[PDB]
Amino acid sequence: SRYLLSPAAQAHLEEIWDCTYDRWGVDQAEQYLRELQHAIDRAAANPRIGRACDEIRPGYRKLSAGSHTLFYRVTGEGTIDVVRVLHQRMDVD
Amino acid sequence: SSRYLLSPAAQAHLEEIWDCTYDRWGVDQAEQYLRELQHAIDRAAANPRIGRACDEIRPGYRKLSAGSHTLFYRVTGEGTIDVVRVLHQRMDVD
Amino acid sequence: KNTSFVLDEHYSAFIDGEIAAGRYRSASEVIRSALRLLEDRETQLRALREALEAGERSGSSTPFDFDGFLGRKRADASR
Amino acid sequence: LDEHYSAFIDGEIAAGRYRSASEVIRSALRLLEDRETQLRALREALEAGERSGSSTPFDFDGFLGRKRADASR
Amino acid sequence: TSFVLDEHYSAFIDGEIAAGRYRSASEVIRSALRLLEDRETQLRALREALE
Amino acid sequence: LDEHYSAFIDGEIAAGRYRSASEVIRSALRLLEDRETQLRALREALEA
């Protein structure tokens, strides 16, 4: 349904787009951001598809989104708050 | 996006991923996740070079992470991608 | 400098199995290896925690309009 | 072994992370065996993919449409 | 089963406790062994399913 | 030299991945050195 992105996460979406555009052009840029949007939409409909990761930081869940990972909390409603979108190289499993 | 081929194993696995996603989270989530994998397949099909070569793993292969999975594919003489396996990320040694 | 420990009965059986399987020689060899694994994990976990903290300190989270964002970015490249 | 890796082993012991040449060598060989097992699993998975049959065009919309219809009956 | 940890691994455990990540030496050690047991069993299943 | 490790080395040579025991060990040490270097580099980066 609805979701929130942190300022950090929004800025990273923009950097991903720009990086992909420079290397691959506008359609590749747009489709990869849409791929990330599908993963964000997946989590926002059922926040529990993400694996709980309190051992990283209390309250967070994580969801693999291809070559990135979404790290997110669930706010005072049923709403997910995407705090960071990190490259998979940082994902510990 | 352009052409792509999927191996029979890759097709069978797509169905399994759908069934297991369906059984746990319902039809909408199953469809959404398969759509997410389709996006990565379409991206690779439109430019096969976006996936990183991994000849050290197998000559002529490239891989591209997608959702919780990884596409492993070859490139046809025509320039078409051939997706041989769709493997869970736990199997991806990098 | 030099400390001794006693293991519970499950992890003593785990260590016995690792020594029997041939991959480790002693209990200290298993423990020391496991603690190097833990420290390697913790260093990666530290990097993830700092990244999330920087994300929180970023500011309040807001809604995000993918259509508008993607529209604007495509338009800009067209300029 | 060779001279560079003898100094690497000795540096590891001097730094307190390892206590013997054997501990470094055995740890490294365990790491290599593990990586080799994972790589072998990957390559055999790819071989099984090649051997499952010739690759075929796919109608993703029809696959999804039919799965959804199958489950709605 | 008992074992000895030298000054370097003891200091690792102490810094781990002093950082508030664990409450006791035994907790650091159990958490280390849990990680290794999970690793070695997965790889042993892989080795099993392989040959 | 232990029986599990000699056997793993023999098995790696037989597969044609390596040509000598020293090669296997050098290869194993290279993996460990690289791993430890990456982790020290991440550790020191965080300390900065």
Numbering used by the authors:
A (entry chain B): 2 to 94
B (entry chain A): 1 to 94
C (entry chain C): 2 to 80
D (entry chain D): 8 to 80
E (entry chain E): 4 to 54
F (entry chain F): 8 to 55
What's the publication's text?
M. tuberculosis encodes two ParDE systems and several studies on the ParE1 and ParE2 toxins have shown their ability to inhibit gyrase enzymes from E. coli, M. smegmatis and M. tuberculosis. Toxin-antitoxin (TA) systems are found in most bacterial genomes and generally comprise small bicistronic loci encoding a protein toxin and a protein or RNA antitoxin. Here, we present microbiological, biochemical, structural and biophysical characterisation of the ParDE1 and ParDE2 TA systems from M. tuberculosis.
A coiled-coil interaction is present, however, between helix α2 of the primary ParD1 chains and helix α2 of the auxiliary ParD1 chains, forming alongside the anti-parallel β sheet that is itself part of a ribbon-helix-helix (RHH) DNA binding motif. ParD1 antitoxin binds to these patches similarly to how ParD2 was observed binding ParE2, though it is notable that ParE1 does not encode the proposed C-terminal helix in ParE2 that is displaced by ParD2.
